[PDB]
Amino acid sequence: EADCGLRPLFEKKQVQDQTEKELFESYIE
Amino acid sequence: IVEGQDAEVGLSPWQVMLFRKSPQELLCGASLISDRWVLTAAHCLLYPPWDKNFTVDDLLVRIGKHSRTRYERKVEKISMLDKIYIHPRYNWKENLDRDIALLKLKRPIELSDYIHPVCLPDKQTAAKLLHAGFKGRVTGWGNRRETWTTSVAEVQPSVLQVVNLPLVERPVCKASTRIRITDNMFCAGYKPGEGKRGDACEGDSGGPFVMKSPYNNRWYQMGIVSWGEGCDRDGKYGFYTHVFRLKKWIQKVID
Description:
The structure holds two protein chains of two kinds.
Chain A: H1 20-27
Chain B: E1 5-6, E2 15-20, E3 25-32, E4 37-40, E5 46-47, E6 52-53, E7 59-63, E8 77-79, E9 81-86, E10 101-105, H1 123-129, E11 135-140, E12 161-166, H2 170-175, E13 185-188, E14 208-212, E15 219-227, E16 238-242, H3 243-252
Antiparallel strand pairs in B: 1-12, 2-3, 2-7, 3-4, 4-10, 5-6, 7-8, 9-10, 11-12, 11-14, 13-16, 14-15, 15-16
């Protein structure tokens, strides 16, 4: 596809999921 | 998923369950990368020692589910397969190297809030994202515990399971086992001194290991759950097929 990886109930809705910050926190460690 | 939690409705829209047609049973996980293509692990399809070699006739694929206790009919799709593509250099004899398979769906499907494909990685995304310590995410309906006897107690989520796990450096992965690990596989999971736990387990294989890109806000499939020794054992890690290394093969079978 071309709109792959953007979720209808999350990314598309500016809503971040419950455990997303755990991933991002790992990046800037 | 050993030590994960319940997925949120719509958490993983590229999830796909590979079922046995009759008697219906969950055989493995899988993921939607287009409206016609599903990605999974070759061993879920072919493992000669167990005389396993499924064909498009004994298989069914389910899409749009995050709770396994009902036929979600309205949000869920069930499709037959058209074709099965197994890597011609898959190695079942020694270490399941190149453990990757592509399933072509009979007819394209209609995306929804619950059905949406994930992205394959490109050269620059794999560079940014593949660093030991960075965390990825594994999903699946597989067993919540390894075990002995029967252990038929529990170990069967009613909802899709999620666990985020850190990428482990290659030398730690090689030294955790006496099996020859190749460049087409990476391991993830916590170390003994990290206190935390989590791992994929029986029935989770073939499923996705994804990571979210901060540069574009998109989810990318970095690995396919492949194997490990037991589930969540101390000093051991789960091994995932390196999607980006097999990118070329994936590309040849779609054009």
